[PDB]
Design a binder for this molecule. Sequence first.
Ligand SMILES: N[C@@H](CCC(=O)N[C@@H](CSCc1ccc([N+](=O)[O-])cc1)C(=O)NCC(=O)O)C(=O)O
Ligand SMILES: N[C@@H](CCC(=O)N[C@@H](CSCc1ccc([N+](=O)[O-])cc1)C(=O)NCC(=O)O)C(=O)O
Lengths: 213, 213
Amino acid sequence: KPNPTITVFERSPDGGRGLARDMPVRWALEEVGQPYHVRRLSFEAMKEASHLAYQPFGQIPSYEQGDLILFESGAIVMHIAQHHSGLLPEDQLRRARTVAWMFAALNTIEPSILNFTTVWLFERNEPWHEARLARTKEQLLKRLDELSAWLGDREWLEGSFSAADILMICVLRRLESSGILKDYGNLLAYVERGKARPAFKRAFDAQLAVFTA
Amino acid sequence: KPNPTITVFERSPDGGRGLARDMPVRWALEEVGQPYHVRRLSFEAMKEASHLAYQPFGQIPSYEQGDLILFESGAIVMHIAQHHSGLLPEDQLRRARTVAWMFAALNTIEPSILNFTTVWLFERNEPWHEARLARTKEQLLKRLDELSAWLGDREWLEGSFSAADILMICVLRRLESSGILKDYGNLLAYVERGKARPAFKRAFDAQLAVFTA
Ligand SMILES: N[C@@H](CCC(=O)N[C@@H](CSCc1ccc([N+](=O)[O-])cc1)C(=O)NCC(=O)O)C(=O)O
Ligand SMILES: N[C@@H](CCC(=O)N[C@@H](CSCc1ccc([N+](=O)[O-])cc1)C(=O)NCC(=O)O)C(=O)O
C-alpha cells in the first residue's frame, strides 16, 4: 500500500505557525501512524491548470494515494479516520455524533471565526472597519459561549480523542493571535490538550520544517 | 425501528422556498424512502435552554431517532446516506470522492455564496455596501467559474446521484433570487436536474405545507 502524498504551500503565509489546512491532515496521519509525503506548491504553481486536476478550486491540501485523489481537509481527515483505527469510535451511535462534531467544527464554528478574522486582518483602513469588526466579534463570542457551555468538563468532544477534535482544535487555533480564547478557560485548555499530543508535535514540526527549509 | 424526528422553523424566514437547512435533510429522507416527522419551533423556542439539548448553537435542524440525537445538516445527511442505499456508492474510492464533494458543498462553495448573500441582503444602507458587494461577488464568480469548469457535462458530481448533490444543490439554490446562475448554464441545468427528482418535490411540498399551515 503506497503512502499518500499531500499538497502544501512552499512558502506558507502562516509564518510557520501550522494554521494552514494541511495541518489537520498531517495531524490525522500522525495519530494513525501513517507515513506520508508532501508536494510543495508555489503560489504560481497552485494557479496552474495542472493543479486543478488535484484541487478544482486551486487550493491546498489535496491527497493522492494510488488512483485515489481527494480534496477538502475535512473529507481527507474523514478518509484517514475511516480506514485506520483511533480517530472514529466503533460504536455506530458514537460514530455518528463524532461526524456531527466534524461538520460543526467546519460549518458552525469555522465560519464564525473566519467572518471575524477576515475583517480583523484583511479589512483595516477601510471603515467602518472597527464597526464591522464589532459585529463579527459579537457573533463569534456568542458561538464560543455556546461551545464552551456545551463542552463543560469534557476532555474531548465525543468521549475519546477523535477526528472531530483534530478539526475543531485546528479551527480554534486561528484565534490564538487574537487572545480571545483567554476569556474561555475550558476552550483554551481544550486546545492546549490537543497541542500536547505527540502526534500534534510531529505534524507541527513537519510543517515548520517546510517553512524553515 | 422508529422514524426520525427533525426540528424545523414554525415560521420559516424563507417564504416557503425551501432554502432553510432542513431541506437537504428532508430530501435525503425522501430519496431513501424513510418516513419522518417534524417538530416546529418558534423563534423564541429555539432560544430556550431545552432546545440546546438537541442543537448546542440554538439552530435547526436537529435529528432525533431513539437514543440518537444529531445536529449539522451535513452530518445528518451523512448518517442517512450511511445506513440506507442510494446516496453513497458502495465502491470505496467513489465513496471517498462523494464525501469530498459533500464537504466541498459546505466548506468551499457555501462560504463563497454566504459571504455574498450576507452583504447583498443584510447590509444595505451602510456603505460601502456596493463596494463590499463587488468584492464578495468577484470571489463568488471565481468559485462558480471553477465549479462549472469542473462539472463539464457530468449529470451529477460523482457518477450516480448522491448525498453530495443534495448538499450542493441546496447550497446553490441560495443564488436563485440573485439570477447569478443564469450566467452558468451547466450549473443552472444541474440545479434543475435535482429539482425535477420526485424526492425533491416530496421534500419541497412538505416544507411548503409547514409554511402554509
Ligand atoms: N474547504 C477547503 C479550503 C481550502 C483552503 O482554504 N485552502 C487555502 C489554504 S488554508 C487557509 C489558510 C490560509 C492562510 C493561513 N494563515 O494563517 O496564514 C491560515 C489558513 C489555500 O489554498 N489558499 C490559497 C489560495 O486561495 O490561493 C479545505 O478545507 O480543504
Ligand atoms: N451548520 C449548521 C447551520 C444551521 C443553521 O444555520 N441554521 C439556521 C437555519 S438555516 C439558514 C437559513 C436561514 C434563512 C434562510 N432563508 O432563506 O430565509 C435560508 C437558510 C438557523 O437555525 N437560524 C436561526 C438562528 O440562527 O437563530 C447546519 O448546517 O445544520
